[PDB]
């Protein structure tokens with residue numbers, strides 16, 4: 001009464017005959033057009049589909065190194081499946097339930113931020129942030145100048161370059177970027193929001209792709225020129241030590257802390273402190289500060305801090321490929337890229353991203369940060385689109401541990417862009 | 429004084445929990461909370477934590493009623509009844525439970541983790557003796573339940589649905605909860621009317637399963653031929669462990685258990701909806717198909733022992749770290765307080781006790797015929813079915829001083845518990861057909 005025994009070769013921990021069973025199930029669901037629009041239905045598809053295009057992206061000879069590898073193959077194959085029509089409407093719905101309705105994206109980011117920040121030493125927190133802010137500024141200045149120089153060459157005035165190209169790309173992505181950008185444009189120029197948003201969303205999305213490619217490239221550069229890489233680390237020589245016994249309970253507390261620290265940040269940002277100075281504070285920017293305060297407070301035992309890291313490790317190593325399926329489906333839209341895929345737009349955007357890379361490399365190097373991780377966090381993770389872009393880039397360069405800096409770039413840096421945007425939109 | 433701040437609420441030291449509690453209070457009074465997985469889990473973690481810890485430390489509650497999970501769903505139901513929850517808080521819990529369907533995932537994980545945790549060889553050996561002995565206990569509990577039900581003027585369909593099947597089910601979250609979904613899927617009636625009655629009868633029966641366990645031991649000493657004190661069979665002559673070599677255990681294997689849980693559900697879902705939506709006139713619910721599927725997956729040997737252990741680890745995480753979250757949801761979506769109180773009847777106590785008796789009569793007879801000792805059989809295949817899942821097994825075996833039979837009680841709670849889900853689907857469907 002035995003069909004088989006386990007084979008040798010594994011796909012996502014699953015030997016071929018076992019993965020076959022899973023794949024067949026997904027094929028049955030597909031052809032019979034039957035899948036629950038749930039976490040169960042979503043995760044079922046996302047796991048199985050993520051598993052196959054992950055192992056392929058991990059083994060594709062030229063692709064794995066200079067393109068982001070496994071997560072980028074998944075990210076692109078899934079985006080293609082939507083564009084082509086290979087996905088059922090309800091398969092799309094199932095993935096959308098997970099990523100947007102259930103908000104697995106926010107859960108994913110919140111778990112990672114909590115694991116990253118609670119794992120660091122208290123004395124190290126405030127100093128990193130103080131050195132990270134001017135590093136962001138250099139990336140903006142770098143992205144601006146490169147976009148202007150490439151702008152005038154194509155016969156593009158300064159305004160169109162800053163308003164339609166630089167700011168959307170360097171802004172906080174979609175919801176907290178192109179959308180409030182679309183407001184200010186309409187709230188000043190008086191034109192339609194759609195004419196700005198449609199252009200902005202298409203431009204920054206192209207730049208997002210380049211930021212993903214460049215991330216994989218900068219990872220290679222850092223192995224070629226070791227002196228430039230922190231090999232994951234951003235701060236020079238930086239990371240209660242008593243790693244006690246660790247139970248499932250302490251890992252569960254990590255999820256308690258991740259969701260609770262988000263909840264507090266949500267309340268503060270939506271009801272208590274929506275804007276400090278002229279700058280608005282996204283709830284993920286508030287969450288970074290809250291987790292930092294929770295670290296500095298001393299309220300978390302090192303076994304609980306270890307639990308938050310262990311959960312963050314489960315997510316980033318076991319649910320990453322699932323997430324990339326959802327991000328490829330929900331936050332790409334290949335058509336909007338192609339409808340704007342003018343090799344004038346491609347060049348301006350790509351150069352602007354390079355401008356952010358160069359500026360942030362220069363900035364952090366002056367600060368005392370590693371040149372490679374400076375251009376990825378304060379450069380690429382500004383020129384990408386929000387948290388979805390942060391997870392694409394950091395997975396492509398295999399630096400998911402830098403999620404907190406990336407979020408400071410996406411949220412706090414994107415809010416800074418908003419201020420600049422309000423000015424540039426006003427004067428001219 | 430400093431002794432106090434060392435006290436833990438769900439793994440959180442008292443000052444750290446206060447932070448989490450203050451956070452929930454601020455969200456409540458500013459009326460601000462995301463109605464997604466983040467806001468929901470935060471609410472359900474914090475709320476489940478405090479009332480779970482209170483539930484554990486109330487004497488009659490922990491020993492008789494069910495402790496933490498019971499206190500949680502009762503209090504969460506009270507928050508709805510008394511309008512303590514805001515609308516957003518109710519939306520957040522409901523969205524997690526039904527819209528995101530964290531309930532199906534939870535049940536999918538439990539079923540997968542429980543059945544795959546079973547040794548393959550032991551699984552097949554059970555089909556020749558121990559599983560039939562389990563079936564006899566269900567038949568026994570059925571016959572006794574119908575009769576006592578009749579004497580009280582309770583129809584057969586209600587006795588089977590609200591009394592017998594929950595009692596012989598795999599407890600609360602592994603029995604009454606998935607039984608409510610199957611009921612609602614076949615009947616069309618609210619799951620709240622099923623669960624609220626089922627969980628009360630469950631709790632009463634579990635008490636009698638413990639009391640009878642002690643009695644069966646006292647009987648086993650007086651009638652020594654019934655006992656074979658300690659052992660179930662007559663040949664093995666050694667109890668400790670016989671294993672499948674499980675070595676490495678990483679996050680990858682537990683994540684595979686998540687793949688298997690979510691994929692085995694998908695297969696059971698397609699079968700129930702598009703492939704085999706009705707064998708006979710009987711519609712088999714996907715929870716029932718999943719039991720058969722997951723049991724089959726174990727039989728095929730396709731899964732490595734390291735992956736089986738990964739499924740069990742994920743199952744253990746959900747059942748010990750996420751159960752208190754689920755019970756907040758259970759109280760909000762499955763609980764009618766009046767239906768529970770109305771079920772707390774001396775009549776229901778009597779019916780419950782006799783159903784449990786029927787389980788020990790059925791399992792003794794059927795076990796006597798197969799080659800098992802009557803006393804132990806009635807304890808392992810009778811009482812450890814009639815009790816409240818794994819927690820009940822520990823209470824029952826403690827009362828009869830037979831913790832060595834724990835492997836057999838595990839088969840009852842897991843295999844026989846999923847089998848009840850299959851029987852229930854078949855029985856529920858047959859009852860609505862005219």
Ligand SMILES: CCCCCCCCO[C@@H]1O[C@H](CO)[C@@H](O)[C@H](O)[C@H]1O
Nearest residue numbers: 024025027028029030031032033702
């Ligand atoms: C390995 C995958 C085998 C797939 C076999 C099932 C093929 C689908 O089967 C059919 O799909 C039709 C839609 O095209 C439906 O209308 C039918 O109800 C269904 O039977």
Ligand SMILES: CCCCCCCCO[C@@H]1O[C@H](CO)[C@@H](O)[C@H](O)[C@H]1O
Nearest residue numbers: 116117125129235238239292401404
């Ligand atoms: C306001 C507080 C700012 C927090 C900055 C991010 C800290 C969490 O990020 C951590 O940074 C560490 C050193 O910087 C690195 O060693 C870790 O890999 C990274 O996870």
Ligand SMILES: CCCCCCCCO[C@@H]1O[C@H](CO)[C@@H](O)[C@H](O)[C@H]1O
Nearest residue numbers: 505506507508509510511512513765
């Ligand atoms: C007499 C009018 C019909 C009965 C109205 C009261 C029904 C219960 O309604 C309300 O339930 C909640 C729980 O106590 C509380 O908010 C109120 O005290 C109670 O009035």
Ligand SMILES: CCCCCCCCCCC
Nearest residue numbers: 251311314679682742745
């Ligand atoms: C939707 C919640 C995802 C569950 C993740 C469980 C992580 C358990 C880690 C066990 C080592």
Ligand SMILES: [Cl-]
Nearest residue numbers: 459460461462
């Ligand atoms: Cl709100």
Ligand SMILES: [Cl-]
Nearest residue numbers: 513514515516
């Ligand atoms: Cl309200």
Ligand code: NA
Nearest residue numbers: 169171382384
């Ligand atoms: Na951006």
Ligand code: NA
Nearest residue numbers: 381382386410
């Ligand atoms: Na970003």
Ligand code: NA
Nearest residue numbers: 595597813814
């Ligand atoms: Na039971």
Ligand code: NA
Nearest residue numbers: 812813817841
């Ligand atoms: Na049991």
